[PDB]
């Protein structure tokens, strides 16, 4: 490792160094997974032709790159790139910035991008019908993301690169987008994709690269791996052929003998609830919450998931129905704006200083979420991802009967998501407390949950919360509405997506068994 010939790019005002690049292949989806700050987007910019790599020296031409990749399958790729025979289509990471770069209505922009005549089909697949007449200034993060994916899908090219397409998308939208993206590979096109949602990455990919190193300092692309081996090696934290142990422990999913079936005592019940906001209505079916369980909450956005959590938190009053509880609630809101003049250490030490000094909390919460490295940071200067982790930590440090975490995966990289899953679960097991977690990341839902609460309905119009039910029944119901099936992986115990049209997918769809444990 760290070979000079493999040194692809060094940022001058930074000194971050990237080693190696992923393979791209027509008729294949190549997936890229790794912590942020390790060069994933840098690699995409290079392969797209947007950044001429300097080879960790002073190279400033494609000729120098072509020579450096002598005897590499990428040599001819870069020749074609240099000569304009190829011009990759790039759905970039920074979809937030679309309003600053582009004006006008959405329909206008997708018309321009239409080089395939599939405007209606793409608009359908990404469910953009209600967004077509909107002006870009009035689009949500999630709508900006889907308009970007749409515009990339509509271009005619050979190479299509998608940098973090699941960001801002609900569970339905990310899985639908993955299906639509993968269809490019069935047409003989090449797809490169960077993803932090491991279920989506799995479903998307034929080949996987793991990116490893030290965020902000250096990153290295693994050798190409099969999808199963790659993700399994990522979870184990050890790349065998490269002989690199990049995490000192394994991230394990539940194998079928681990968690004892327990008939839990009821903590609280709630009756039928209704919450109206003008023309929107949420109806919640009567349900029960057990002592010491975690309920995962899943569904499309615009449906009342947050609204439900807010009623549980006592920050919102139901329109109809009555919550009669004598419980303490700790609440991690979906959207947080820092308004705190002090450091992370000050904030968390004032919640529970004894827990900050506890070995269990250091091991299971503070170290894995990277909170200790944030201790002397001002809370008001934290980024989205930093503030998310601190808020989760702050919530889990409180002493409560019930912990409510609304979309903790937002702004988190793959490594941080796995850490957050483990922390929620281990802390709730340790302290014998109860949690509800709203999440769109399927592997997070699978790791944290004992039972599942499904929301269904029409975004912005109506929503219905089903009573909490078993993992199998819950996921079957949800996944039926998307038409995607998952099996279990014997090695890691992780849910493993069946690709569209595969034999296991057919067998499962006929039996109506969309999800195994």
């Amino acid at each position: 490792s760290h070979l000079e010939e493999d040194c692809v790019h060094r940022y001058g005002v930074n000194a971050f160094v990237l080693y190696r690049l992923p393979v791209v292949k027509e008729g294949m989806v190549v997936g890229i997974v790794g912590p942020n700050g390790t060069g994933k987007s840098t690699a995409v910019k290079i392969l797209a032709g947007q950044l001429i790599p300097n080879l960790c020296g002073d190279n400033d031409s494609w000729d120098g790159v072509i020579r450096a990749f002598r005897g590499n399958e990428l040599q001819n790729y870069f020749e074609k790139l240099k000569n304009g025979e190829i011009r990759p289509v790039v759905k970039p990471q920074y979809v937030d910035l679309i309003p600053k770069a582009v004006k006008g209505k959405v329909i206008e922009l997708l018309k321009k991008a239409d080089e395939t005549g599939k405007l209606e089909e793409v608009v359908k697949a990404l469910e953009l019908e209600n967004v077509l007449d909107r002006e870009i200034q009035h689009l949500s993060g999630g709508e900006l993301q889907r308009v970007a994916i749409a515009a990339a899908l509509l271009r005619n090219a050979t190479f299509y690169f998608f940098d973090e397409p699941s960001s801002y998308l609900d569970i339905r939208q990310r899985l639908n987008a993955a299906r639509a993206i993968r269809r490019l590979s069935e047409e003989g096109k090449s797809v490169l994709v960077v993803e932090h949602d491991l279920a989506v990455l799995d479903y998307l990919s034929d080949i996987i690269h793991v990116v490893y190193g030290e965020p902000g300092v250096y990153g290295i692309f693994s050798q190409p791996k099969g999808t199963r081996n790659g993700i399994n090696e990522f979870l184990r934290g050890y790349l065998k052929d490269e002989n690199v142990r990049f995490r000192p422990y394994e991230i394990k999913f539940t194998k079928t003998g681990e968690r004892v079936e327990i008939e839990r005592e009821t903590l609280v019940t709630y009756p039928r609830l209704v919450k109206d906001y003008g023309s929107f209505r949420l109806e919640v079916e009567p349900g029960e919450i057990k002592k010491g369980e975690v309920i995962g909450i899943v569904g499309p956005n615009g449906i009342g998931k947050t609204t439900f959590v807010k009623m549980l938190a006592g920050v919102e009053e139901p329109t109809e129905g009555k919550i009669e509880w004598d419980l303490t609630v700790a609440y991690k809101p979906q959207y947080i704006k820092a308004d705190y003049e002090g450091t992370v250490y000050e904030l968390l030490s004032k919640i529970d200083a004894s827990k900050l000094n506890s070995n269990f909390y250091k091991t299971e919460l503070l170290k894995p979420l990277g909170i200790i490295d944030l201790y002397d940071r001002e809370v008001n200067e934290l980024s989205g991802g930093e503030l998310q982790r601190v808020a989760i930590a702050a919530t889990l440090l409180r002493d409560a009967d019930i912990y409510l975490l609304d979309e903790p995966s937002a702004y988190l990289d793959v490594e941080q998501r796995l850490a957050v899953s483990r922390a929620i679960r281990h802390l709730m097991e340790k302290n014998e407390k109860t949690a509800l977690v709203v999440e769109h990341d399927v592997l997070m839902i699978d790791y944290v949950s004992d039972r599942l609460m499904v929301f269904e309905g029409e975004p912005g119009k109506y929503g219905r919360a089903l009573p909490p039910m078993g993992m199998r029944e819950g996921m079957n119901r949800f996944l039926a509405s998307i038409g995607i099936t998952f099996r279990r992986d014997p090695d890691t115990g992780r849910p493993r997506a069946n690709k569209e049209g595969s034999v296991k997918d057919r067998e499962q769809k006929e039996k109506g068994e969309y999800y195994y444990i």
Partner: peptide, 14 residues
């Protein structure tokens, strides 16, 4: 905000 973005995004759309 970086002018790298306005280039990247306009290419996808424009």
């Amino acid at each position: 905000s970086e002018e790298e973005a306005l280039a990247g995004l306009s290419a996808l759309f424009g």
